[PDB]
Amino acid sequence: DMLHVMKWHNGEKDYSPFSDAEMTRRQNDVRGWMAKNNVDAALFTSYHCINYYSGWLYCYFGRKYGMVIDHNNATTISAGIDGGQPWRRSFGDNITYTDWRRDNFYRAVRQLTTGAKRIGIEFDHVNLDFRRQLEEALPGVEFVDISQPSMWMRTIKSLEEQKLIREGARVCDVGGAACAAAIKAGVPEHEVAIATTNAMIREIAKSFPFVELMDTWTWFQSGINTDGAHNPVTNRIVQSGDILSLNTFPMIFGYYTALERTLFCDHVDDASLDIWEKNVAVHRRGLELIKPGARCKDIALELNEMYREWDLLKYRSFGYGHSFGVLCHYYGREAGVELREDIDTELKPGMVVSMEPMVMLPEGMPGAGGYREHDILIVGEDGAENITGFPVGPEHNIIRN
Amino acid sequence: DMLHVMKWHNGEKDYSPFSDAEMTRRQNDVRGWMAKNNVDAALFTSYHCINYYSGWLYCYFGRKYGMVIDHNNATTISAGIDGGQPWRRSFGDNITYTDWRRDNFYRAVRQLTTGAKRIGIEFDHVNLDFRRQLEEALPGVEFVDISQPSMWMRTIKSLEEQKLIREGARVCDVGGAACAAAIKAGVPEHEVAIATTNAMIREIAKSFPFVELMDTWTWFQSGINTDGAHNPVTNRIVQSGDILSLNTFPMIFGYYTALERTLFCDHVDDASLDIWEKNVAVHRRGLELIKPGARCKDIALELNEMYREWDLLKYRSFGYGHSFGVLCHYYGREAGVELREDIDTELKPGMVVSMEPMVMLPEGMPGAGGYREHDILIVGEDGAENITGFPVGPEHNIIRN
Numbered sequence: 043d044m045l046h047v048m049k050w051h052n053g054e055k056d057y058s059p060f061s062d063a064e065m066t067r068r069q070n071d072v073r074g075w076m077a078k079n080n081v082d083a084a085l086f087t088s089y090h091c092i093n094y095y096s097g098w099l100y101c102y103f104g105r106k107y108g109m110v111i112d113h114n115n116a117t118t119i120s121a122g123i124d125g126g127q128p129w130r131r132s133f134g135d136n137i138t139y140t141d142w143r144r145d146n147f148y149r150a151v152r153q154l155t156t157g158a159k160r161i162g163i164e165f166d167h168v169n170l171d172f173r174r175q176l177e178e179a180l181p182g183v184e185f186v187d188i189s190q191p192s193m194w195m196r197t198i199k200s201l202e203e204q205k206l207i208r209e210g211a212r213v214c215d216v217g218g219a220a221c222a223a224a225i226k227a228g229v230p231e232h233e234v235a236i237a238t239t240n241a242m243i244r245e246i247a248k249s250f251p252f253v254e255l256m257d258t259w260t261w262f263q264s265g266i267n268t269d270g271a272h273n274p275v276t277n278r279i280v281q282s283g284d285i286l287s288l289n290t291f292p293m294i295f296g297y298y299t300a301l302e303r304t305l306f307c308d309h310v311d312d313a314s315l316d317i318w319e320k321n322v323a324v325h326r327r328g329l330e331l332i333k334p335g336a337r338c339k340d341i342a343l344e345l346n347e348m349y350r351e352w353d354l355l356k357y358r359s360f361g362y363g364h365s366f367g368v369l370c371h372y373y374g375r376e377a378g379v380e381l382r383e384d385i386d387t388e389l390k391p392g393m394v395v396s397m398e399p400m401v402m403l404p405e406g407m408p409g410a411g412g413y414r415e416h417d418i419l420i421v422g423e424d425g426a427e428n429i430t431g432f433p434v435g436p437e438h439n440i441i442r443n
Numbered sequence: 444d445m446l447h448v449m450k451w452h453n454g455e456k457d458y459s460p461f462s463d464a465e466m467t468r469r470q471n472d473v474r475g476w477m478a479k480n481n482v483d484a485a486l487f488t489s490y491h492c493i494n495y496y497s498g499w500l501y502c503y504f505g506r507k508y509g510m511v512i513d514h515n516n517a518t519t520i521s522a523g524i525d526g527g528q529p530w531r532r533s534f535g536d537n538i539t540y541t542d543w544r545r546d547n548f549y550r551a552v553r554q555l556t557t558g559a560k561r562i563g564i565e566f567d568h569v570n571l572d573f574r575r576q577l578e579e580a581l582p583g584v585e586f587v588d589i590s591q592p593s594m595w596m597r598t599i600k601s602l603e604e605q606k607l608i609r610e611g612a613r614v615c616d617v618g619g620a621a622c623a624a625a626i627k628a629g630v631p632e633h634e635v636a637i638a639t640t641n642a643m644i645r646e647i648a649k650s651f652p653f654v655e656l657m658d659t660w661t662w663f664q665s666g667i668n669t670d671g672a673h674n675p676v677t678n679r680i681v682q683s684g685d686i687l688s689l690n691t692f693p694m695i696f697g698y699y700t701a702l703e704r705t706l707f708c709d710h711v712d713d714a715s716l717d718i719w720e721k722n723v724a725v726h727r728r729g730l731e732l733i734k735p736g737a738r739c740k741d742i743a744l745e746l747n748e749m750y751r752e753w754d755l756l757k758y759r760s761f762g763y764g765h766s767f768g769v770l771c772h773y774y775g776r777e778a779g780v781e782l783r784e785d786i787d788t789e790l791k792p793g794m795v796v797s798m799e800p801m802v803m804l805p806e807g808m809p810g811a812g813g814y815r816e817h818d819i820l821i822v823g824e825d826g827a828e829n830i831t832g833f834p835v836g837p838e839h840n841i842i843r844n
Contacts, residue, residue, distance in 0.1 A: 044747075044756075044784070045757070050803075050805075052667065052670050052803075052805050052806055053667050053670075053806055099675075101673035101675075101772050102772065102773060103673060103765075103772055103776060104765070104770070104775070104776030104778060121761065122759070122760045122761050123671065123672050123673060123760050123761035123801070124671040124672075124673060124674070125670035125671035125674070125760065125803050125813065126667070126670050126671070126805075127668075127670065127671040127673075127674045140761075141761050141762045141781070141783050142743075142783060142784045142785070143784070143785055144783075144785055165570065165571040165572045166570055166572060167570055168570060168571055169566065169567060169568055169569060169570050169571075170566040170569055170570075170571070170574060170588075171566045171567060171588075173571060230648065231656075232644055232645070232648050232656045235656070236641050236644060236645075240637050240641070243633055243637060244633070244637075247631065247633045247678040248678075250678070252677065252678065253677065253678060254675035254676065254677055255632075255633045255636070255675065255676045255677065255678065256660075256675040256676060259657075266453070266454050266527070267528075269453055269454075269526035269527055269528065270524060270525040270526040270527070270528040271524050271525075272502035272504065272524060272525060273525070273526070273528045274502075274655040274656065274657035275655070275656040275657060276653065276654070276655060276656065277648035277649070277651075277653070277654060277656065346445075355444070355445065358445075358523070358541075359523050359524050359526065360522065360523050360524035360541075360542050361542045364504075364505070369505075371502055371503065371504060372503060372773040374505070375504060375505030377505055380542075382542050382543065382545075383445075383543045383544070384543070384544055384545055400524070402523075402526050404451070404453040404526075404527070405453055405454055405527075412526065
């Protein structure tokens, strides 16, 4: 018969930016939490939880993936299509399931959880059909949530995580300089984004002995494309006087950093400058408002009042910031740390957060477009350190090429 | 004073590859399903379902996205971070919720599902917490799965879908030409991937009056990196005689196509050539097995016999093919159509299936590496139509740049 679950440990362990002690403390924090709550094993299934505790980021082509952490073991679960890449990239053990049987993944989970009675899973990620299948394949097992305690444990970044986040912020600035240098009246958006992403990919591949070059992208928006922070790249021609939006996102070992700057082609008028100068002032004040001990709601309420002074709150787009770490445009984000009005979570030293005030003026109104700056701050004992070094306002953001 | 569910129809509608009739036919298929099951409204929340029925592919940054369709209306739900971009790319109506209150998204679902008692949601996608928040916001409403019938309806591709898929296959062959042209002993993998992805992005931009240039990527693997079909691009240096894997993935309006080929840098040894000729032989037979009458498991079990003759069956990586349409490496795939040994589903005219037999030999064994070809076939009334034009085997895929 065919193989259902096997080990395909092809090759040796790959380089990782994190030490063995750093990947060990992460897997031990789970073990310490499971022992406090009488949880026998943990089964992670999402991109971000698996990449955090194992260091390996999986590709989801409709297949299930997992990682089981017992009180003594740590094992990732991957598919035959992946071969040995998951074992080379994972901290710990690794097993493989095949496509020849619909329940081969649950066969693999069962091998790593024999004897367990309380398994912790991600209520954030496991869908309805998934939870029913896990219940059927593991009868007599009570399921508890670890997505929330894991989320809180990821909000406090270690020094090694901060060192990688600083390195991502450096690639952000390199991608920004390549973006500013490619902007000219008449260039399409995708030509700007191509040069911006190419420069970051080459800077990442040069800055590590081994690294996977994946997911890194750029959002270069002109004109009405700036009205949304996530608006994809188009083929629109940049015209002189158009509002612009620089957005660089290098992805390094699943970790995410961002540099976002509003720009203008050739020149900036007076009407749009009034909105730009005010949004920069809100950004500068927001940087002051990130301190250890301040609540997320207190930061949004104060900055919202600043928008009321100039009648700009009515055109707000989204929250003032979010947490960092293991996230991307298709995974992650710790919802506990969001600069939103109804979030009472206080900031703590070791958190990596952003300040990104955005105001959006619709078409048919002077200064129509989307205005947004974005910095990254590492919360310290007395304040926060800014790791985004790119120029912010109109002192150097008037691109005259 | 701060809005909850505003309406932000900024700008005008964008170009779509599909006509208004095609987009209406999909939405009417949902209403026909809801009528037979006494379902009052449908609430889609995933990338693929929202992109299939509305034409708009959202960007998830920890935020909830949805699309409610009545028996007379169809409305997408987007966040204030997106602005008018969702309404500009969605077929139908669109409303916007803000990040100021945690339940602002559920206020939008409520405004679109007034009086509804049975609502269809995606059991494939909605997680446990999302399920809990939904019934807390819509008390006294019975939720039923709609992801499975939606999956079976997307398995049959219309002519307008095939027309867009044929164009994506043409962009694949453009990327493959740029890929092979950038291959040489000494070039890093990311330089090959950069030249490959840039050519596809530029070909897409000039192939549509309006188009979104997003998510298109390339996997170029050399040596041991070929042992996994989804192995990320690295900074590994291609060397003489290395086994290679070309993989081009243009993403056009959420629709996915792929061209994957086995290559060799300067030469191919006899041991690996033998494995390569055998795997291409299985690929040719697989192309002939894509028939309307034939079932998925019968295709797999038949091709497995060919591998058993040469004792290569133990090295098979994954299934022989999957269904196309609205999918990507982070969404989609209709699990009903998979060329796997226990899939009793029968092919049908209109389906778009691939033939991608892959064998993986471990390192330290003669012919070590991953061997894989990949063609796309449209299922007709009598047979299939192969829409992949790039050369297959060793006759031309031995690069000599």
